[PDB]
RNA sequence: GGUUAAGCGACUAAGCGUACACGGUGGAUGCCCUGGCAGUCAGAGGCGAUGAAGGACGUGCUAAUCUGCGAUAAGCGUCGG
RNA sequence: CCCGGCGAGGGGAGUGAAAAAGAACCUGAAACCGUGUACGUACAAGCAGUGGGAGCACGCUUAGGCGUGUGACUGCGUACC
RNA sequence: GUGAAGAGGGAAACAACCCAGACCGCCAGCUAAGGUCCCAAAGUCAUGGUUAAGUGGGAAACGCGGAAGA
RNA sequence: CGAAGGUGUGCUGUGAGGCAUGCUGGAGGUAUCAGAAGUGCGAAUGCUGACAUAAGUAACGAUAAAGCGGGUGAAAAGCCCGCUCGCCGGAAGACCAAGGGUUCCUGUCCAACGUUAAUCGGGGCAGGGUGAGUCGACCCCUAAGGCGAGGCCGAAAGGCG
RNA sequence: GCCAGGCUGUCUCCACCCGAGACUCAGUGAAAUUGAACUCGCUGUGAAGAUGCAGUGUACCCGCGGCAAG
């Protein structure tokens, strides 16, 4: 079967997170975990936590064979944007959008 | 009374966009560009409705001329021979015969030369 | 010096194509501790070249 | 252009760099090991190893110069008394640097730099 | 079948475009009203120095708000449903 | 109950007609952002469409050269108010 | 007369030049102006000549020189 | 036994259009004939809500300057302790007037803020803290000035005193 | 406003060095402006400065540091 784990409203930008997410697409669990551990990115650690949660869900809810898992479908999208006001010269203001990333990882031994 | 035009606007936008498939992004997904794109494509199709006839006629003429030159006669001479012999084979038929039947076009050129001489 | 037309999403993608990172894919397993670490780097429990580092 | 030039900038003033090197060398001598950025440890080597080289020989002038450098008394006392005899039989290579990954705050390279022996 | 030589020749997509399935902020469209606008029939057409309209501060078993009330303070006394 | 940091967040079980109703909570559009599928694209120039057009994958036909997805090549084409 | 309010074909594009007033459709024929060496569809067709200069493919006044467009 | 709404497919008409149905929808829609529009949007430097654009570029807010070992913490360079270097030092020291009104301390925590990480903070929640005959206000007198019964003037308000 | 003496990189003529940006990495993260772009050079035309028209030549696709001639 397929086990899905997601992180919603993450404190990172979807564009930046995809840069590290694309690496662990179509790769085995052990190599993906090693790459995420040795990759120095906030998005890297976020996706590491997401994949760890996915693996734990597979081990608990589903039957067995942790080793034979794989990253079948990993995708990250943009979510709610927090609007903030930043002063500038001449008394003007700029609207800055702090972005959040919804990350989803689906694994399946089959 | 008050009337809300949201449904009508949505239906018209969908109708316009349905004909804008495969227009390289903005011209397919943007309603404003798609509408103008649809009109321009329709104008091009209207012009091509006759451009197709022109191109097919020219291609048939070229194929008939090629076959006539292979057989040893000019296209104009062959057409004149057919007309004076009262042969009214259409150019499309002549090209198709020249393509799928060599002996048929050999007979055509023989008859045209006989009529000319 | 300002843009005259909107850059396309295709242009955005082709410009960001070079922003992809690379995987180390060079994990080295220590002979003594038997754990993986980066090349020329210590392990989690301060091991390197079969030597017990302070590991603190 | 760095054409045959030595000494990484490590952006700072000249006096700031001198004070940084002196303080870090003193701390390294005191603790027998420190954890710092790899370029920082590499720049440390050049200024710290000569300290032990000079400490190899014990004399009033050498002790005064070793005090003038690093401006400390405990470091001088430890020198000529502990590291001196320890490295008397070794020429060069008093300090070794071992990389230990990156830093969470910075992601810059970091390494442990320490004496080869360290007296366990 | 092996060699030499000449001609032809797809299979690669770092990324991009097109069409389909699934998704993310999005709250538009549809449905509903303890909400407003406009008229009809009636009372009232004024409140108050025996202290008006409007406010500050307090009042629960209550830390904050709305509402009622004012040291008798989310109530009190008499008479009815 | 499990991963997660004692968290946020998520995956199971259960209530629930529905959790594709989980408090960011009826229906959930368009512009924008990705994944998987099929085609084209690293020697080719211009309102990026149109007619022809093979080729490339699937279903139908109980073969029938049919439709869908793309358009290598090619004639024409200097947006709208 | 055209455009303004007329599409289409020919001259390179071009509106004031030539033919020709688009109801729609057919992988039909003919023709007007313009062309028949290819690009790009058609005569490398004939008959009697002119040109030696690429004149054609830049222009008048004298006996090809005047005759020059960034 | 499945209506509006949203999204595809097929059929149909010369047209704006109409009918059948898969999918989410679980409660309304409305034939034919007639009447009124806040009756049909692609532009008016149009307004409101959301989103790409330049772009993951500038920038991260005086060149006084941080570093080392340990404690807490999953994460330590910005929290705490100890050591070293530097800056102001008629200031970047201390208290008051005006102003601000609990930002002051403790316990706890990362939902949002610090142009970054945060366990920290002038951030969220709960508790504590302000003790006056000698401080100042308050109170008595008072310049500039204001109010100003009687009074003068002015259509009324209202000006002067 | 002009002249006399020293003075100096204003200059002949610009060269090196010390710091902050400029360049890479880690984290946060805007604006001006934006009809649609598969956005080359030359000749002719063209509402009169042609990336887009007719003729011709060149050019594998896409990033990064600068010049601004448009």
**Does the nearest atom of strand I lie within 7 Å of A93's Cβ?**
no
Tokens for A85, please give them: 């006001």
Nucleotide at minimal C1' distance from the B57 CA? G27
Q: What is the Cα–Cα distance from B11 to A93, expressed in whole angstroms?
A: 39
| Interface touch D101/C41, C-beta < 8 Å | yes
Query: Which of D33, D35, D112 to substitute to test the interface with C, most C CBs within 10 Å?
Result: D112
Q: Are D33 and D100 in contact (CB under 8 A)?
A: no
- Round to whole Å and give the CA distance between D18 and D48: 12
Q: What Å resolution does this PDB entry report? A: 3.0
Q: Inter-chain contact C24–A20, Cβ cutoff 8 Å?
A: no
What CA–CA distance (Å, rounded) separates C32 from C27?
15
**Separation CA A60–CA A98 (nearest Å):** 35
Cβ atoms of A100 and A60 within 8 Å: the answer is no
Residues of C in Cβ contact (< 8 Å) with B26 = 8
- The total domain count for chain B is 1
Q: Which chains touch D (3 or more CB pairs under 8 A)?
A: C
Domains in chain A and their CATH numbers? 1-110 (3.90.470.10)
Q: Is D1 helix (H, G, I), strand (E, B) or coil?
A: coil
Cα–Cα dist A49/A69, whole Å: 16
Q: Where do breaks (C to N over 2.5 Å) occur in chain A, by preceding residue number? A: none
Q: Does C40 touch chain D (CB under 8 A)?
A: yes
Nearest to B113 by CA among B86, B73, B69, B76: B73
3-state secondary structure B77-115: HHHHHHHHCCCCCCHHHHHHHHHHCHHHHHHHHHHHHHH
Name the strands in the sheet holding A71-78, side by side, starting at the edge strand that comes first in the sequence.
A3-10, A101-107, A71-78
Indicate which CATH number applies to the domain containing D88: 3.90.1030.10
Residue D83 maps to a domain:
yes
Nearest nt (C1') from C13 Cα: E15
Provide the domain limits for residue B72: 1-117
| Domain hosting residue C25, numbered range | 1-56
What whole-number distance in Å separates Cα of residue A15 and Cα of residue A99? 10
User: Which residues, other chains included, contact D48 with Cβ-Cβ below 8 Å and sequence gap of 6+?
Assistant: D25, D28, D29, D94, D95
- Chains sharing 3 or more CB pairs under 8 A with chain C: A, B, D
CB D54 within 8 A of CB D65: yes
What approach was used to elucidate this structure? cryo-EM
Are there at least 3 beta-carbon pairs closer than 8 Å between B and A? no
In chain C, what residues touch D33 (CB-CB under 8 Å)?
A: 54
**Coil, strand, or helix at residue D42?**
helix
The tokens describing D57, both together, are: 């020989």
Q: Measured between CB atoms, which of A19, A22, A38 is closest to C24? A: A38
Which residues in B83-114 are b (16+ Cβ under 10 Å) and which e?
Answer: eeeeeeeebeebbebbeeeeeebeebbeebee
- A90 annotated to bind ligand: yes
D47 at the C interface (CB within 8 A)? Answer: no
For residue B36, give the nucleotide whose C1' atom is nearest its CA. Answer: F80
Q: What gap in Å lies between CA B77 and CA B65, rounded to an integer?
A: 10
d(Cα A7, Cα A52) in Å, to the nearest integer? 12
Are the C-beta atoms of residues D92 and D52 closer than 8 Å to each other?
A: no
């Amino acid at each position: 079967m397929e086990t899905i784990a997601k992180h919603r409203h993450a404190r990172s930008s979807a564009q930046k997170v995809r840069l590290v997410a694309d690496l662990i697409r179509g790769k085995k669990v052990s190599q993906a975990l090693d790459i995420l551990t040795y990759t120095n990115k906030k998005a890297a650690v976020l996706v590491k936590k997401v994949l760890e949660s996915a693996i734990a869900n597979a081990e608990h809810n589903d039957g067995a064979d942790i080793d034979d898992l794989k990253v079948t479908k990993i995708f990250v999208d943009e979510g709610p944007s927090m609007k903030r006001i930043m002063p500038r010269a001449k008394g003007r203001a700029d609207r800055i959008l702090k972005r959040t990333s919804h990350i989803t990882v689906v694994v399946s031994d089959r | 009374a008050r009337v809300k035009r949201g449904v009508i606007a949505r239906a018209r936008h969908k109708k316009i966009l349905k004909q804008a498939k495969g227009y390289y992004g903005a011209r397919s997904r943007v309603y404003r560009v798609a509408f103008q794109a649809v009109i321009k494509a329709g104008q091009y199709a209207y012009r091509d409705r006759r451009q197709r006839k022109r191109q097919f006629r020219q291609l048939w003429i070229a194929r008939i001329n090629a076959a006539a030159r292979q057989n040893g006669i000019s296209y104009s001479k062959f057409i004149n021979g057919l007309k004076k012999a009262s042969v009214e084979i259409d150019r499309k038929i002549l090209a198709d015969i020249a393509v799928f039947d060599k002996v048929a076009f050999t007979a055509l050129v023989e008859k045209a030369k006989a009529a000319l001489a | 010096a300002v843009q005259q037309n909107k850059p396309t999403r295709s242009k955005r993608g082709m410009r960001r194509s070079h922003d992809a990172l690379t995987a180390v894919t060079s994990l080295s397993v220590d002979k003594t501790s038997g754990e993986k670490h980066l090349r020329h780097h210590i392990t989690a429990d301060g091991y390197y070249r079969g030597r017990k580092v302070i590991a603190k | 252009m760095r054409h045959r030039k030595s000494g990484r900038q490590l952006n700072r003033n000249s006096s700031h760099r001198q004070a940084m090197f002196r303080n870090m060398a003193g701390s390294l001598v005191r603790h027998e090991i420190i954890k710092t950025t790899l370029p920082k440890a590499k720049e440390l080597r050049r200024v710290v190893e000569p300290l032990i080289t000079l400490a190899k020989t014990d004399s009033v002038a050498n002790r005064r110069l070793a005090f003038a450098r690093t401006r400390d008394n405990e470091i001088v006392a430890k020198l000529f008394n502990e590291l001196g005899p320890r490295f008397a039989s070794r020429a060069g290579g008093y300090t070794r640097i071992l990389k230990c990954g990156f830093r969470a705050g910075d992601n810059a390279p970091m390494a442990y730099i320490e004496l080869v022996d360290r007296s366990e």
